[PDB]
Write an enzyme that holds these catalytic residues in place. Structure first.
Site: not given
Ligand SMILES: Nc1nc(=O)c2ncn([C@H]3C[C@H](O)[C@@H](CO)O3)c2[nH]1
Ligand SMILES: O=c1ccn([C@@H]2O[C@H](COP(=O)(O)OP(=O)(O)O)[C@@H](O)[C@H]2O)c(=O)[nH]1
Ligand SMILES: O=c1ccn([C@@H]2O[C@H](COP(=O)(O)OP(=O)(O)O)[C@@H](O)[C@H]2O)c(=O)[nH]1
Ligand SMILES: Nc1nc(=O)c2ncn([C@H]3C[C@H](O)[C@@H](CO)O3)c2[nH]1
Lengths: 208, 218
Positions: B95, B33
């Site tokens: 993801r 990510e």
């Molecule tokens: N709103 C939101 N939408 C996403 O698609 C998303 N994908 C990840 N995350 C947040 C969760 C972890 O804090 C952190 C690391 O994965 O970022 C998201 N938060």
């Protein structure tokens, strides 16, 4: 397909002009700005939300306006000429730039927008490559009067200063040059007196 | 190249897990990510991750669109750049565009963090991107790292990211519900579920055995 964008300030007369072009030839189609989608996303009017609170809604609008242009223009690709009403260039360099300079987008929103635009352009740049630009040039004051003729509800608050900013960006891009561009003066009503413009358009297309 | 995404709640251990898989085999590469990018916005400054947690009614849509874009960009770049030398290559996505939309964005809309207009625009945006770039990133499998909301909460606490400290248990429960119904109850592709409630940093050998057995069928 030869691809031509029609650029100009708000209410310059681009929809009016392109409507006249549509009908002139079986070989010319038009890709209009998808404004009907922007006013109804029943739905939310994001064009309106942007005008009422540009600090809150500009990035969301700009993002979506840009996406909607590329979709329409990509979809239209399937002596043929295709007239684009505006372009990914004016999306960024006229409108989005002006929102950032105006503090309607902050640095974060503006970085995110450019990153996105950069990337779209990499992927789809070859296909949406313009062969020419038709610039419909009208003074800010003329565009301001045409806004109140047309009478869109969303556009009624628009300051003359806003139009002047947009105009200057057009002039510097298209006129001062600080792609083959035809510049047409559209200060005088042309809805009937359009014969000269069309010949000029026809003559421009043949240089390309 | 088999493409496998690793799904799970916030702080279930995907980064940890992905770091382990990376090192076990030359034919196994990961696409993490881009939380570094979300934490300091710049093109290939602003902490949008933080903006989203301090004011999600304002910044949710902006984060979501950026997160999804950056994900596709990362996955596409690894697809073309990695695994040229591998015999059984597998690319593990931390993801996917599916969890972006069906877990996170969906949940923010459901929680009134995005309004109807924002939600429509996102779906539109997501559909177009998926049409244009979706067949390149289509998954061959999902590994679901399952951890309880309670466990994820205390791991958020353990990791200590400033941005995350106000995250309520309530919020993780919703995200957990969405993963369970999506990946387990199939009421929301081969799925390997792995229970990661007990630390696996130094007892991962049989998680890995499970992963290898899972990959064979694909
Ligand atoms: N709103 C939101 N939408 C996403 O698609 C998303 N994908 C990840 N995350 C947040 C969760 C972890 O804090 C952190 C690391 O994965 O970022 C998201 N938060
Ligand atoms: O010669 C003209 C050109 C335009 N208009 C009016 O000016 C407005 C804006 O023109 P248009 O919608 O074509 O502008 P665009 O925003 O598309 O440039 C509309 O009310 C037109 O009917 C006009 O009265 N005479
Ligand atoms: O078996 C584990 C898995 C994770 N963690 C810790 O829990 C936090 C969340 O893990 P990670 O960042 O990998 O989770 P992600 O958000 O990527 O799922 C980090 O402090 C990890 O060091 C741990 O102590 N043991
Ligand atoms: N902010 C903003 N960004 C754009 O890229 C853009 N392109 C067009 N428009 C505006 C002009 C007319 O009001 C109306 C239709 O042209 O919407 C834009 N407004």
């Amino acid at each position: 397909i030869k691809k031509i964008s029609i650029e100009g300030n708000i209410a310059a007369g681009k929809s009016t002009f392109v409507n006249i072009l549509k009908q002139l030839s079986e070989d010319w189609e038009v890709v209009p700005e998808p404004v009907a989608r922007w006013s109804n996303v029943n739905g939310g009017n994001v064009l309106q939300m942007m005008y009422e609170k540009p600090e809150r809604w500009s990035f969301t609008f700009q993002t979506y306006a840009c996406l909607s242009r590329i979709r329409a223009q990509l979809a239209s690709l399937n002596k043929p000429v295709l007239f684009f009403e505006r372009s990914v260039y004016s999306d960024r360099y006229i409108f989005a730039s002006n929102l950032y300079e105006s503090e309607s987008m902050n640095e974060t929103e503006w970085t995110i927008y450019q990153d996105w635009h950069d990337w779209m352009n990499n992927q789809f740049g070859q296909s949406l490559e313009l062969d020419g630009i038709i610039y419909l040039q009208a003074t800010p004051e003329t565009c301001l009067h045409r806004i109140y003729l047309r009478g869109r509800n969303e556009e009624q608050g628009i300051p003359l200063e806003y139009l002047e900013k947009l105009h200057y960006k057009h002039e510097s891009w298209l006129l001062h040059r600080t792609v083959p561009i035809l510049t047409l003066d559209v200060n005088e009503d042309f809805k009937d007196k359009y014969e000269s413009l069309v010949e000029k358009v026809k003559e421009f297309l043949s240089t390309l």
